[PDB]
């Protein structure tokens, strides 16, 4: 039993006595103390004229914005810090706040580690365990199949080229209760080895297995359930994974998220992935802006037709620069890279990609690697339709080129090995669309250097 | 302390064992029982071949949609009803749910009186006291200055013409702890009477005062603080206002809201006001669709340039009919009606209306009532600029025509009475833009008849 420190957000669209009654009712609760009050706008009542008049009558310190027509975001942030608030309680309404303004206020309050709540809603700030004994980056994103894993694999290779030994702790959508370690820095991960793991009941197409193969690195397979609006998760073993990663042979750590969910482990720096294919409201409203606000570097992905228009790409770029002008921003597209040789082969291509981009990926594969793609399955995520596509194409291909994602091991690899084909795993590589935005390796190196410098200087 | 019945929302983007662990963790909590699970979509992490395995392995009943690509909204609603669930717990994430899908799920769950919550968020359903002993309508809206009061005054007069005696309980953002009673059916409310009230410290420009004067009815002045996202309020005396309304001389009750807030008293039927001037996201996302879903009749307001484009008005109409197909929908604009005679007089017009629409209101006043508008103040909300306009124009006018809103009594009426002018109070009348949408009085009568029929039969 200890009191929670509450800041009240109030407005001049309410008459002061009903506000005073509300603050006295909140303060007179057991386990709550109202420590400050912020007037967030409105002027219908100005009979009480002076912040010191309001403060005298409340017996609480009272804060106002420089402009009564605008939400005093900076004053709310400064007040939550100054009074070290546990809770910010919203006693406002239209016209002073709409949903957009509430999510803007929420994004500030939750970042300072305070609860944001009102009459009918509550938001919990992200728990964040300070457990890593190595310099580190978080790789998070706004959704699924936007390239969090693809960017993470690439970043690991860049960090290796920079003469560091990276470990990826991947927060996946399942896995053993004790996090599993994959020594992709020591072990030759083949199709037959992945099937041997799948036969033991191991989730061999998970991101830790993919990053181990695609980037030849040590990885730790963690699990989670649920992924909230702000990005928190219901249960996870990622804290245990970060503890494991400390003890193993590595000298840089990537904490990689899943879906819109954020690993609850403190890192020196953060890379945020944003698919230009996603609705603008998911990027510029709700807790999109909160996620973009965490970034040192933003990778915008899917920056091409048919996935996004030029105007959409420019709108996403413009918004990111407005809300996070400190962040470096790189717009990108994904292109395939086989982890093996496919030159002059008849190729069956297996992917999770949208059907509208398969033609472009095939055109690229044939033009660059000199293969002939005899058939495609975009159904790695759908086991019945996958088997249908395999029976159609399997006989006319020399080898199957597959993403190491979804049913790629226990269905597609199994069928291809029993049919006597070679199986080559396929990475997705982030390629910069526009050289005016500079080089993606240099952008990652900048963030890696910041993470190392931060770790050396802060204890 | 009593056990709360929880339904879990789960997906096939999580591997079964981490979902099972999550459900066992939730069920093993004190005063929570997991009673059912709804599988809301996704496929790739289903190694389970038969959906019956899922329920067998959880030891919980599990319900599925007909289409694994779509959220089974209907199944969620049917299960919350069937189990009389207190909580719905979201153990999903991107790609299966985005923010929009979560607000669609929230709107269903909260309407059935269940909490909706996830990893980092919680939403509380509306408190609703069952206290009225008379047939009744709630008049609520999506914002401020969208015409809730204007529609409410009109509805009261329509109910009077239909041979009933209506009472308006107005939930404002201010007023005495004991609700204030105004007998506008028995008292001739003059400018001098309103100044006598303002000098006693009464909020004479409040909605209960306005409805009393504009509609010559009994009204009860209630107060509240805060207005949440769903529309709940932190504190209010509206329960006491409804108890007062039962005792007094009336045979129909209108419970009128304020801002986006909803009076927490049960009513037979609901009228929802939606300003077409508001951003589409506030109408078609968050808890706009929840508010529109409460409606028997939706009044769309501000349906003209400069406030809304024809395309906007059509988008609002189309959306409302999609989410609430049995609701009657009437698109409208507001025009002045003096509560007195202004024919051939020199008029100083005082309003809270935007500068961009004053010309249309003036053009209407002069064309309909044959007055000469010698000047306008759009500054009833801004006491300094109001006095500047009054000093300029007061000498030119025979009478001041004013909305009974904001500084209309304690500044504008006071200056006009001391300057020896007549003061005429001005209603805002909802006018239907297109006769193909039918007559607004008939639309109100339909809802009033439903409220009377419901009241007679639900006893
Ligand atoms: N040019 C492209 N346009 C659109 N999608 C692409 C393109 N190239 C690859 N993809 C798809 O992008 C996705 C990247 O997925 P992944 O790296 O697993 O990201 P995440 O961790 O965000 O799910 C895959 O589904 C892949 O097939
Ligand atoms: N034609 C019009 N276009 C736009 N606004 C108008 C028009 N006519 C009146 N108004 C304004 O509409 C508002 C209606 O306010 P009111 O009836 O108090 O509704 P609420 O209770 O929702 O605030 C007032 O500010 C009034 O001046
Ligand atoms: O499940 C899917 O991805 C496709 C079906 O794939 P095909 O059977 O057309 O290959 O759904 P659709 O796009 O037809 O609505
Ligand atoms: O706050 C309230 O009591 C009412 C009126 O405000 P005022 O007209 O008294 O400023 O709000 P609304 O019905 O306009 O949303
Ligand atoms: O407050 C307002 O609406 C007016 C007041 O100034 P005047 O209209 O009295 O000049 O300024 P604006 O917003 O048009 O710049
Ligand atoms: Mg207390
Ligand atoms: Mg991934
Ligand atoms: Mg329990
Ligand atoms: Mg009103």
Numbering used by the authors:
A (entry chain BBB), B (entry chain AAA): 2 to 460
Can you provide the manuscript's text about this entry?
The enzyme cyclic di-phosphoglycerate synthetase that is involved in the production of the osmolyte cyclic 2,3-diphosphoglycerate has been studied both biochemically and structurally. The reaction involves the transfer of the γ-phosphate group from ATP to the substrate 2,3 -diphosphoglycerate and the subsequent SN2 attack to form a phosphoanhydride. The unique structure of cDPGS is made up of an N-terminal domain which is crucial for the stabilization of the active dimeric structure and the ligand interactions, and a C-terminal domain that contains a P-loop kinase fold as part of its structure. Since the cDPGS reaction is exergonic at cellular concentrations, cDPG accumulation is favored thermodynamically until this reaction reaches equilibrium. cDPG appears to play a role in the thermoprotection of proteins, and increased thermostability has been demonstrated for several model enzymes in its presence.
To elucidate the substrate binding residues of cDPGS, the structure of the 2,3 DPG, ADP/Mg2+ bound enzyme complex was solved by molecular replacement to a resolution of 2.2 Å resolution, resulting in Rwork and Rfree values of 21.5 and 25.6%, respectively. The 2,3 DPG binding site is located between the C-terminal domain of the one protomer and the N-terminal domain of the other protomer of the dimer. The ADP and Mg2+ are clearly resolved and reside in the pocket formed within the C-terminal domain. The 2,3 DPG is clearly resolved in only three of the four protomers making up the asymmetric unit of the crystal. A phosphate molecule has been modeled in the active site of the 4th protomer. The Walker A/P-loop surrounds the pyrophosphate moiety of the ADP while coordinating with the Mg2+ atom. A superposition of the apo- and ADP/Mg2+ bound forms of cDPGS reveals a large movement of several α-helices that close around the nucleotide, which highlight the significant conformational changes that accompany ligand binding. The helices α5, α8, α9 and α14 show a motion of up to 8.5, 7.0, 6.7, and 2.6 Å, respectively. A closer look at the active site revealed that the closure is triggered by the binding of the substrate and ADP which brings the Walker A/P-loop close enough to contribute to the stabilization of 2,3 DPG. Residues K145 and R146 move closer to the substrate to form multiple hydrogen bonds with it.
